[PDB]
Amino acid sequence: FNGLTGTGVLTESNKKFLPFQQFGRDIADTTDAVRDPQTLEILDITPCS
Amino acid sequence: AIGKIQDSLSSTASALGKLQDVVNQNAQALNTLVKQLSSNFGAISSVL
Ligand SMILES: *[C@@H]1O[C@H](CO)[C@@H](O)[C@H](O)[C@H]1NC(C)=O
């Protein structure tokens, strides 16, 4: 996503990103959730099992 | 005496502080270990 490389599972979520917010971060600044740059929708990033 | 111990355990939350401190210390160690991934350590970024 816009050069942010990672491995995980993209699922539909309910985390209301603010309109100026593009990336979400965890405690250890791992990418928790992203907004898709094409369609303005919200997705979690859960790393694979 | 058994009833008094029951009332004391129901009323005082600091009676089991000897176990609560162990659980809290484990939580602090785990949280510190997680949060140490956010440090740059002199590099350009903390994200691999
Ligand atoms: C990507 O394409 C959709 C139409 O499929 C369009 O609505 C959207 O605005 C485009 N993304 C950007 C950033 O313009």
From Swiss-Prot, chain A:
It comes from Severe acute respiratory syndrome coronavirus 2 (2019-nCoV). It comes from the Viruses. Attaches the virion to the cell membrane by interacting with host receptor, initiating the infection. The major receptor is host ACE2. When S2/S2' has been cleaved, binding to the receptor triggers direct fusion at the cell membrane. When S2/S2' has not been cleaved, binding to the receptor results in internalization of the virus by endocytosis using host TFRC and GRM2 and leading to fusion of the virion membrane with the host endosomal membrane. Alternatively, may use NRP1/NRP2 and integrin as entry receptors. Binds to host ACE2. RBD also interacts with the N-linked glycan on 'Asn-90' of ACE2. Cleavage of S generates a polybasic C-terminal sequence on S1 that binds to host Neuropilin-1 (NRP1) and Neuropilin-2 (NRP2) receptors. Interacts with host integrin alpha-5/beta-1 (ITGA5:ITGB1) and with ACE2 in complex with integrin alpha-5/beta-1 (ITGA5:ITGB1). May interact via cytoplasmic c-terminus with M protein. May interact (via N-terminus) with host bilirubin and biliverdin, thereby preventing antibody binding to the SARS-CoV-2 spike NTD via an allosteric mechanism. This is Spike protein S1.
